[PDB]
Amino acid sequence: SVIRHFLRDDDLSPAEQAEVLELAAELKKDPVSRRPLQGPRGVAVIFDKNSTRTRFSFELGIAQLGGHAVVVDSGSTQLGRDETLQDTAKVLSRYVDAIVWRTFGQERLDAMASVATVPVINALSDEFHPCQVLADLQTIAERKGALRGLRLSYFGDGANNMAHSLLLGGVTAGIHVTVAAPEGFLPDPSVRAAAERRAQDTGASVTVTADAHAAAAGADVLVTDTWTSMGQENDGLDRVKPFRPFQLNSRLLALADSDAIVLHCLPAHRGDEITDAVMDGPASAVWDEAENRLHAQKALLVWLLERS
Amino acid sequence: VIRHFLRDDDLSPAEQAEVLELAAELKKDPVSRRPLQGPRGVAVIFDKNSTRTRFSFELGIAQLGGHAVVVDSGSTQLGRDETLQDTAKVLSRYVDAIVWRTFGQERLDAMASVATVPVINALSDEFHPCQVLADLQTIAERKGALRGLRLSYFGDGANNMAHSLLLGGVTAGIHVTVAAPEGFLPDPSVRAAAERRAQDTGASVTVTADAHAAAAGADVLVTDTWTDRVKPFRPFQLNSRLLALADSDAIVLHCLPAHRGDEITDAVMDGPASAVWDEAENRLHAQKALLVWLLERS
């Protein structure tokens, strides 16, 4: 069998994404019904930069599949330093049944996935957050039913990992995705072109705009995320003034469809990209969205393991 | 309906007796109760690390069928990157209980007011209630019934063990004495709090600088680390002289680690009255009992 990896959202075809999302719903209802890692078989969960939320979700999810997550945190000689990345993929492929990796540049994920003989999953990277978007789509489906034809709008930094993954994973689900972002903060051209091509296969569409009010009008789902990652705090930019018109506040939510829901990859900086009234009001799905990381990541693992 | 255990008086006398009975059953049959089979998760969070607390909870949760997700001080500082309540609301979807080691109580109190799973104080700057459950289990297995026993704590009466021996001790019906120098006395709000549960159980609270008098007739002698800034405690050192004043077959307890030669001597630590090794082991069983009991009511 070809070893399948999940490094970016378009790694799943539209039909394959639907299978994973269906499995996520079944695992949410019966969370110990699938035990492909019974033994326990090991899964490596590797952090180039620590992420407590990602670790909790994967550590527990892997255990509920029967397995044992072996967590390697950032303070451990760093992948690439004491050994080549390819030496590491070679030995890890003897110990564990899958490799879950939080890292920085996409080229590192690609390099690992080209030599590892077990599935590699991008837990979170600078360019994509594919597992969060699987959880997002699971949450939207719980609240709204069929994903096909929904209109989703993302606000804020249009070139961070969530904007890119909502583009790719959203159009893979048949969702019309709009990114509202100020000039200079637009999606990467390669990602935008991949999303446009993928949207052709599903009947979806990609829109990029600097008009937040237009992006909010008629939306079924409004999404935002922090305006600045930890790496960007030293980039020299004023990263507040450009984004203030894109704040997801009560006024912006009122422009959307009356049944609209709100998503946000946690943590939120309340008062910046989103307000308290929105975060804790009735349209917020952020808490279900956080919980669903567990189920969507378990489903992705079950799916990749049985294909590999 | 969502019960927390942040202080020893969070349990009534009848409820404490329930937990201690369950700790004895779990010591005998350590894998017979599996309320976390799955595994279901339990968060174990440290604002400051405690290897002893982590070791005991990690193994115990696993023996209850679950999986402890340990978050160290570096990742915690609860409030690090999101509000406390934002953290409590998500944790309540992932885990079935939250075990937390933090400094002040006000931090503990907030978490418990919002979380929708039980919150447990693993160790605080003011209370160490799980250790006292392990102490009461250790006393019961060596002395029988707790009610009517005389326990004396020696040394720093202003630290977490002194506060928890007062509250947990009187809750079990034990006459508790604290022997401490004037500068290092119990917190007044804990003292009156202990003084009030003692009325319900027939126990009592005494605070003296008289170590000789606190040791005389004692059935259980307890001390703890003091930390020359360490001058006022050495008349309270639990040595062979003080112990010789106690009741026959008295036992000695000490939340570990012990600094041998300071608050306690080798002769007492390694002698026949010492129960400190069983006491340390019983954190495992008493904490499992506390978890089992909190989980089946919450």
Add this chain to the structure above:
Amino acid sequence: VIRHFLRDDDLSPAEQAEVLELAAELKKDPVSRRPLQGPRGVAVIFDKNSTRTRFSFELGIAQLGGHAVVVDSGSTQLGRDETLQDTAKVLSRYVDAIVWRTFGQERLDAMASVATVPVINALSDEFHPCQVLADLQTIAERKGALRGLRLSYFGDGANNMAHSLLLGGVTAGIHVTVAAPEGFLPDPSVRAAAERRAQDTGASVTVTADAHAAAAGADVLVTDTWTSMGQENDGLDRVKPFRPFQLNSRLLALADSDAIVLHCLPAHRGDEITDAVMDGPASAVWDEAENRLHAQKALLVWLLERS
């Protein structure tokens, strides 16, 4: 009697054979032995962290049904806030074995003299006995019987791998050669213990500075990094003396034609070993890394059986 494994010769030749046989059985059936079902705990303690050691022990203990409680170097170092004796006594009530990565051998000895559960040396300054069990497992699967084999180690003759290959190798009946430059020779006490144990097994011990002679006729070539982290500030040029001892293609071609190459990872490609040797058909470094898992499980199973 409570058995410990602090150095390679803590197992007799017959006992080592039992552990190696178990390791082969566990590699075929990794979850069929559950002596730690419960889970019962095993303490895995690091005075200095070793990701490879923690990784392999953590997974291996889980596959025995147990739960590894890992105590890293961040946690207050053992012996600081209480006596090793005090810690040993309490650990003996919490876990069924103690796995410890520490520095001096006297610390391991002190722990094993007091603990009432088996103590394992996961890795120390003087010995790496678990890695050499994995090495012997690897040689057996690629060569057959171990008795009569000729193994040569190259590089720093006084590091933990050289000492354990000496002791564990002769216990298995292997003729062990250490090729090392002057001033980097095996500890005299370790060499004499190996020579004594060799008299029971028909093995032999050789120490030489002639790398070419050490490689001629060798069935197994082994090397290791030239410098541990605690040696980076020792003041020595730790490259120039070892250059003639590099495991390279020329050196390997002097050995027997089906010789295999071992190396405790990490390897510094270009220094003690070349890319062509690490990646060629004689290299067994990848199976050797994997066998840490199986050999350490076997050792735990065997120690728990007898304690």
